[PDB]
Symmetry: none
Subunit: 231 residues, 2 copies
């Protein structure tokens, strides 16, 4: 011990497994906190004891940097992802295509579309950008079930509280209880990218060892298993 | 709706604002895709649904034309630009002069120079031509941080991943987080020029209306605001 990592909710499973393997191999305890990248960046700005931050978008890393909270010499883009629509496996929902013709109203059946809160959650921000580009936003905005992070959105679908949800490709890979039923075209939104950086003043030898591990082959194997792409 | 525009990454902000104003005034949706002009030209060759193409160089328009993908009767040079070196505003980098005496090695501090990939990105091609003419290319080529388009190069500097980058003058105008620290002499490279053309078979009345709008005073004011010169 002891390293404290703040990581985007979509990284929950990968980062837990990486922490477990790092403990086994290096004997260092890694304690992780998972929430929306917005929530995490704001906590770091306000003074949280995080050593490392991984965001699900460039936006919230840029925010933390602008607040002079990050060791910028350590910043780099670590992972990529896709944006998808999921439905429960028990659902009868057939696979559909996402484009400007998509009939969201018909697909929703009077139900709501689970999303990360588009006011701040990266998954919601990516979703809103895509839906605006596709001309679907005004139709969908009153039909949303916003959640506090992308895993809250995933949970609404897992729990059948919303028939469809917008989450990351990796979220479907991690979930026994939902399946991808549509994938957003990559040209419909900003590339989903995960920057990592050490928090300003926290780059000691132990933190550096874990940072390096995140860029190594053991971690890469785990990230790929969970549906992330390696930058 | 609906017009599809493929435009050089350097046109991102200008073309977004032009699309917004055109929608307001004409009620037509303009959907834009931004990437390196190389990437866009090759997508059009392979069969993309683009109606209009604006390249950041003559080279990639000539390429698209050679592949018989363009309505050549509509081709013309729309804009000009400059080539610059940017640094973050938080950098202590002083302004310098670009000529054959420039000490790039000293300026870089062991860091890398962000550029559009000089194998295909127009900003990289212009950069390589200038650096070769100035006698700096052999020194700099192993010190580059290539990016997939000029906005990727700009992002490396904005994010402090590279201390300096070669981008267009317009890119500095669009970016809160970098400033120009040197300007390439105009005689060091081919004039930065942006040709526009309608894609072969796509010149319907709606596309023609937007094409004409790009040559009008409303668009010209936006292009100038973003640092472009009007041809």
């Amino acid at each position: 011990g002891k390293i404290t990592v703040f990581a985007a909710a979509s990284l929950t499973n990968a980062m837990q497994d990486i922490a477990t393997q790092f403990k086994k191999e290096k004997g260092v305890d890694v304690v992780s906190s998972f929430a929306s990248s917005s929530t995490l960046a704001r906590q770091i700005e306000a003074g949280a004891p995080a050593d490392l931050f991984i965001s699900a978008d460039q936006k919230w890393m840029d925010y933390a940097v602008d607040k002079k909270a990050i060791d910028t010499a350590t910043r780099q883009t670590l992972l990529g992802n896709s944006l998808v629509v999921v439905a429960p496996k028990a659902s009868v929902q057939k696979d559909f295509t996402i484009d400007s013709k998509t009939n969201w109203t018909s697909l929703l059946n009077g139900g709501r579309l689970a999303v990360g809160d588009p006011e701040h959650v990266p998954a919601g921000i990516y979703a809103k950008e895509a839906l605006q580009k596709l001309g679907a936003w005004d139709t969908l905005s009153p039909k949303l079930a916003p959640a506090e992070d992308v895993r809250g959105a995933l949970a609404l679908v897992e729990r059948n509280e919303a028939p469809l949800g917008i989450v990351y490709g990796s979220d479907a890979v991690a979930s026994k209880g939902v399946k991808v039923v549509a994938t957003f075209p990559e040209d419909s939104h900003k590339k989903v990218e995960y920057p990592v950086a050490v928090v300003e003043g926290h780059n000691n030898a132990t933190v550096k060892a874990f940072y390096d591990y995140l860029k190594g082959p053991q971690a890469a194997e785990i990230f790929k298993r969970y549906g992330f792409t390696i930058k």
